[PDB]
């Protein structure tokens, strides 16, 4: 008889056998369909609770009810056509730790870890054939989140050398969670989880966490961060994340292609807040094509070409919304790019040539070269955000936006239409280093939270 | 053509292995003053020089 | 008690936007209840079909145009149920486009009002996180576009308001914003909705130039000024400046380093008047309401 030595494994908290995956436990699971196929929904359940050594809770019971349900059911042939059996039993398995001091919990989180990773994967393979599977869209990652939700919500602090089960997986249920809502197209729901981590964890430091799930906790953090386009706080978490991948001695595959994950992010970043990176370290993590393209970007951004910005944002248009990477950038690389433009021109005008006053004109001038031909100029076929937003004629207005940014030093005058600067031989009295200036007017949060 | 929505489902971290020389530099300490040959660069210069001349 | 049918909505619409948009200014409050009330039928019906979409595009049209000829027009109605009834229609307008999409579906107007729709939160970034995650076809629309370079140009890193975070590197292109404004290409319905900004746009497109200007530089004068921020007339940069405490000297000029304002908005005086510009006028004044709000695919 299998059903009653599952039964006994299960009642004594083994849980060797209680899993989903038919990859191991296949033939068990095979044996009791059909000593199972027998028996009734209804006669089987009162089965669980007549049998000896049940722990007196009516959610373990309903939970082993559920598996058995799930055995007796289960076609091995398709996943999906056994998916209400799958997620009815996870939910009764993760509401079987809810209440802290629940029967078995510490044998039993270990268990939710590794079938959690089962039923994220088939909820996600599954939501993208929604189309074809006539399923909404997000529907099964969305009910796995407000189940892992609730989850979190269980979780409370309250001799002191071993730290509980739930408080050990804390860290790994709010990456999961915040994973998924980046999966689910809303990941603004993160800041819930974000926010309400600290008060949830036992642990005093952030650092007594394993370094992996700190590495992408960052990430995600930095991530949501950009998404509100608060761009140095993401930043720094990037910057953070990488630092911390580096130093991880351990070289598999997933270390190296995480790494890439993050510099896809941490590179953009930083070139907003005028921060560039030697291509040398990380070249272990980025291919020849990717160095190349955020290079000659890197280019254009450095020796002021706002033409060039544009053309290579919309090059890379498709792949850089896939990571709303498109919009922050398009918005905030310009002044960078027209600070350097400026630069140059006020190096070789003034602390060159002695010019303390610049003519509106010049600059004009100078600008058309940069931007290049407006939606409104000759041979345009469409309004577009690469030939809309910037005009030659507006010099100041990007003049006034530089100065009030704090990355020129300089007064206008409407009516002589000519920008004045300190009579100086430095540059950086009049144009200061970018990076500092940006960072001075917009500080981040604390670096390690805890 | 197509009417898909657009993600990237590679930027999900992969699975954790796991179970301090952490001080690398990896940004350009002074991209800012070093200074190159470039042909925009001595265009901007050129026109300055063309509107310089212009104006005397 | 009972529930209009989905056809016979459409067929009030009609007679609304055929008949009655012609008696707009004053009766303002009527049409604004029987949008309502068409738009609720729908839901109570639980019907998302193609009618209830055409139907609360229109109406969104019709708001749009409402904002434009209530504002120019001295007649009293409320800003905030216009706009809200305006947001509720946008919301259920893009839930129902997802729906369709994720169905495998396709809606012909959806562009139009994703670019509505990014024009009314105008500094909230979840608008720009969202229409990045669309279809190419879509992302790439003209009114998109537009409505996204609008965004750009709008935004202010000095952007102040009570709970707003403040964001680097932002653009603060006034001069661009009043030039796009003035443009052919821009659809008159969007026009109308980017002028409920001129107020805070203007305010500091000001500050900002300001800050500029040396201590003891000479006022500016008005003409220069009402260039900048495409004022209607001297009345306008007069009232302006009395709201914001900008001291006009000699009736010619205002003296901007006067200007001392934390943030646009003032904590003991009520907002000032919203406003428009001559040019959307001139241009609703050579069309007819009619094109206008029907001024899309059919459903």
Known sequence: ?450 | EINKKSLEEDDEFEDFPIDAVTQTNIWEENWDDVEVDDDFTNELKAELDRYKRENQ | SDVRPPHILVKTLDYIVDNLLTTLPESEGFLWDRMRSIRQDFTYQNYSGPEAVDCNERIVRIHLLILHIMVKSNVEFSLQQELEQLHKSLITLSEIYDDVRSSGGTCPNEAEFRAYALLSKIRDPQYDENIQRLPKHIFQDKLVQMALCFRRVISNSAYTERGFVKTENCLNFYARFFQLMQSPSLPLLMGFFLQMHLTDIRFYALRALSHTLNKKHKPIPFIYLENMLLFNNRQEIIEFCNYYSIEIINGDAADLKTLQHYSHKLSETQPLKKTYLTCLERRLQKTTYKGLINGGEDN
Not at chain 1, 15 to 40: P, V, Y
Not at chain 1, 373 to 389: K, L, R
């Open chain 1, 1 to 450: 008889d299998m059903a009653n030595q599952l039964l006994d494994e299960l009642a004594h908290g083994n849980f060797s056998h209680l899993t989903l995956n038919l990859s191991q436990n296949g033939r068990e699971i095979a044996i009791l369909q059909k000593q199972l196929t027998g028996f009734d929904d209804k006669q089987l359940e009162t089965f669980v609770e007549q049998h000896p050594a049940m722990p007196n809770d009516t959610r373990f019971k309903i939970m082993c009810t559920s598996f058995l349900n799930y055995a007796r059911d289960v076609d091995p042939w398709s996943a999906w056509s056994s998916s209400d059996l799958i997620f009815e039993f996870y939910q009764c398995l993760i509401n079987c730790l809810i209440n802290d001091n629940a029967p078995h919990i510490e044998m039993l989180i270990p268990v939710a870890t590794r079938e959690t990773e089962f039923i994220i994967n088939l909820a996600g393979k599954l939501d993208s054939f929604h189309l074809q599977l006539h399923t909404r869209s997000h529907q099964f990652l969305s009910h796995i989140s407000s189940i892992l939700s609730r989850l979190f919500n269980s979780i409370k602090p309250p001799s002191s050398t071993n730290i509980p089960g739930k408080q050990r997986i804390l860290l790994y249920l709010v990456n999961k969670l915040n994973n998924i809502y980046f999966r689910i197209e809303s990941p603004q729901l993160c800041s819930n989880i974000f926010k309400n981590f600290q008060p949830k964890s036992m642990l005093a430091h952030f650092n007594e966490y394993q370094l992996d799930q700190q590495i992408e906790y960052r990430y995600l953090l930095g991530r949501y961060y950009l998404l509100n386009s608060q761009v140095h706080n993401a930043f720094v978490q990037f910057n953070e994340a990488f630092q911390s991948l580096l130093n991880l001695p351990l070289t598999n595959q997933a270390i190296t292609r995480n790494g890439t994950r993050i510099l896809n992010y941490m590179i953009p970043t930083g070139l907003i807040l005028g921060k560039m990176v030697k291509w040398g370290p990380l070249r272990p993590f980025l291919s020849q094509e990717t160095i190349d393209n955020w290079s000659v970007l890197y280019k254009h951004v450095r020796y002021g070409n706002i033409q060039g910005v544009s053309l290579w944002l919309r090059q890379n248009e498709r792949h850089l919304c896939a990571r709303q990477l498109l919009i922050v950038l398009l918005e905030k690389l310009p002044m960078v790019t027209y600070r350097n433009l400026i630069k140059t021109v006020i190096k070789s005008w003034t602390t060159e040539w002695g010019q303390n006053k610049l003519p509106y004109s010049l600059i004009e001038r100078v600008l058309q070269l940069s931007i290049g031909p407006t939606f409104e100029d000759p041979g345009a076929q469409e309004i577009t955000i690469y030939n809309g937003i910037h005009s030659p004629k507006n010099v100041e207005n990007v003049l006034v936006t530089l100065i009030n940014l704090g990355l020129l030093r300089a007064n206008c005058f409407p009516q002589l239409q000519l920008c004045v600067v300190k009579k100086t031989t430095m540059i950086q009295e009049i144009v200061p280093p970018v990076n500092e200036r940006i960072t001075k007017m917009f500080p981040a949060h604390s670096h390690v939270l805890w």
